[PDB]
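User: Modeling request: complex.
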Amino acid sequence: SMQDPIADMLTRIRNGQAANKAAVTMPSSKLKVAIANVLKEEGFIEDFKVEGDTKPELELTLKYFQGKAVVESIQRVSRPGLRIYKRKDELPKVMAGLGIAVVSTSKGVMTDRAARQAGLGGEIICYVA
Amino acid sequence: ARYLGPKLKLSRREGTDLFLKSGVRAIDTKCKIEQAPGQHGARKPRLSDYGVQLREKQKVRRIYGVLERQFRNYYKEAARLKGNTGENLLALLEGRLDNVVYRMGFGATRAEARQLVSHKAIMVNGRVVNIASYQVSPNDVVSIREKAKKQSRVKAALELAEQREKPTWLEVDAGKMEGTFKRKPERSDLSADINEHLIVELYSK
Amino acid sequence: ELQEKLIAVNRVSKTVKGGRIFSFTALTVVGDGNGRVGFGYGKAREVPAAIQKAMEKARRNMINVALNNGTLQHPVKGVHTGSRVFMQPASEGTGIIAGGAMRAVLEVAGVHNVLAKAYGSTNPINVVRATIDGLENMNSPEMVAAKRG
Amino acid sequence: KIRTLQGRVVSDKMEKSIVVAIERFVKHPIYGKFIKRTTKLHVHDENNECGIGDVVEIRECRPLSKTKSWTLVRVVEKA
Amino acid sequence: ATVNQLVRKPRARKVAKSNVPALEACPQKRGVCTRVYTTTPKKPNSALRKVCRVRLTNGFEVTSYIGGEGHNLQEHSVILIRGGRVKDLPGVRYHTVRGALDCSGVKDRKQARSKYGVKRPKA
Amino acid sequence: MVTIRLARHGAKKRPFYQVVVADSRNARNGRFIERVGFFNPIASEKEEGTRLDLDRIAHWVGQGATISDRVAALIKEVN
RNA sequence: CCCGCAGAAGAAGCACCGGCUAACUCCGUGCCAGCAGCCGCGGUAAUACGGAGGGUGCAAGCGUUAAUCGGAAUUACUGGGCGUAAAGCGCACGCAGGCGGUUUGUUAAGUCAGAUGUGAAAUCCCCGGGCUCAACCUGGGAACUGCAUCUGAUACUGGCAAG
RNA sequence: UAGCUAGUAGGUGGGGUAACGGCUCACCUAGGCGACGAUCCCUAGCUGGUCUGAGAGGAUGACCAGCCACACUGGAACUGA
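Assistant: Request completed. Predicted assembly structure:
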């Protein structure tokens, strides 16, 4: 990317959700390992392998259950220059809470249940559905 | 401030019988139901979309005798209260003083019992009430005061609504001066023809 | 069984060497009150024969849509080719606070508790396409959980 | 000690008196954007011990002159 | 638009103007009857209508339609204006209070009385 | 010169005061340092027609507030 | 406020009726008189003008005008657009502005968390009292989305340091 | 309406107010504010809240309540907490 590494990643993934390729790959900062170690665990994709040490870079495995593809409607919201630092008792539940809401907390990125369990919100990263 | 002149021709407009004139043979057409809303009488009522909502707002207003200023206050009260907007609206109608005095035996028709409310006769829970919207809370006795216990028409009223269904949500002494607003009248023990969809969706704009 | 409903009827003309031949359109939907809905389209040269042919158009091609409580449960946005439809799930006892064409498709699904809005164009041919796409895109909590894990 | 408001020096062409701007973020009240906004307030100091371009710690004081109600406490930056 | 194009200048309004310029924030103004004119409407109409230019009290002079069914106007006395423009005649953006100071009612209408100077007939 | 007079937020012919610890020279009922206590001459077994939290008057007597007549009714019309 | 006696006895208007918009048929007039909020009606059979029966809605008021928001996603931050529908300066480097590749350290301003202050009472809101009910009067709560301070947090972002 | 400003901007001093003070008078210094909208002309009293909107947002400031401003039109002061 030039001027957001995480926004321009989220174009790269769901273009794989429009031709149903197997593996996708983007140049991977240490933040970017902490991105898809949430999407795997909540079940939206399957497996990933970092590789490279002068170009640290990922091998994400997609997940399309049918002709239907699992990662339906992912959206970045906090785009740079429009930071929305949510207080935690405003929190965006995604699609009546049926999805997950990736929030950049202190204690990590892994965020469904920061509403009650962790107990501190922050900058939204992206809605996920 | 109520509808005076004719009474049954309004039932000829709204299809089925509204209980304004009842207990006698006028069930089966002493006025030719569905035959004369007016001059152009038995005609072609080519209905519309707005109509089948507008008929229902003037169905249950005209079954109880409530004009348009007052019926919207029952609507706007039926939003702040917990639960269904429609079902609370029928609950707030059934708790009305005149609606209770009718189907707790007293009076031939609701318009009579309204006049029996407004002529100092009815007494709620030891208290004189001559206002036709004192909205009764549960576990309260209805009562007719002593100086109008038997005048003409009290004793002949109970027998007519006793062929009508005995409702669950009230208790009543057929002997004398004793009732109980028991609990909330549900949707099941309603007249079951009134469609609460078609009033909530009317005033919402 | 099923349940019909019209939408409208136009004054569709045409032009031949002679004059102005008219026609009539008939927009209907069909849905049994349990979740499946369908629609059709059909013309004629008079009024009542148009309905008769378009009514069978909807008695096939009824699409499978699951409901939750006589209502929707999660806010899909529906758009189809001229118009935007914004359906929010709401409480029980709320009526279908809705505009034109989607009233016909919601009181045939079994849907009875939705507040929703038409956002842009108000042209009832293209409105009724969108809300069927709006209910097509949805997912029940079974479709949530069984697909992700 | 108040907050020890940090600031800069903009200009010194005055006799024992300086001009301080203060970096300051804010939510823009209707759009939700962060505009870096700065103010400009005269600050009393005697020794000329801060130069044009430094970083300055400031507390309030008695209103000495017109247009100037802040004394320097100390400096954390050379020119 | 971009966020930093709405920042440096706000969303300006879509300004709305008044088309009854005999307000001065008022609903009814007094007038002292310049003439009575009998001009003609445009193409889809016919049957020339009854208008009067009116000398106001704010300082203006403007015209007004004298509707009803026949009128009563000697032309050096008082009328009262109503607004609500006629579509037909070019320039008449008012009406007259049918039954007011010096401009009395119409000769025996019997439906929609109150919008003209017709009261209860005999009972 | 601080006083403990009573305000008047009632209906027509239905007074319902407020126990108001306020200033002397100010309004009929428009200003108070603080408000504690209320009153009603329409009790007739409604409820308690007086409820004062007497410690706060025992606070503001200690400052030196001169007390007024109908409150001086209440301090013995409560025990 | 309660009580006593007459005698149905003193007490019903107002707009609309072509479409939107709930309610229709006839006489009179014939592009004249007239209506009207837009669409429009009248030039011999006017469900639209004038009149009469009948109907509709509301009610001690009903219509008309004036005035603000709403429908208007029609100034759009949540919620727009610009290839032809109004709209990409004729084109270039660029100053102040806005915006960061990539790793570690670190500070704690941005933001999150925790309290403590404070946001006058009255309205709005929820359970509860009092006028024969309701308007209205009212007890306590919640809320007043705020700003300033201490304590905490280091994932994002931000200044300093190192790549 | 893009330039404005000399008691203007700052410092020693005296003098001055209940109080810090350019609040005033001599003297030195030559500044001060401004595209994050100064001077300018036009218009307007401000808030708690009312109205409307599902919300944001939009027009409002009559009534009861907070705070200033003004007493026919221009001035200056006396007394006095």
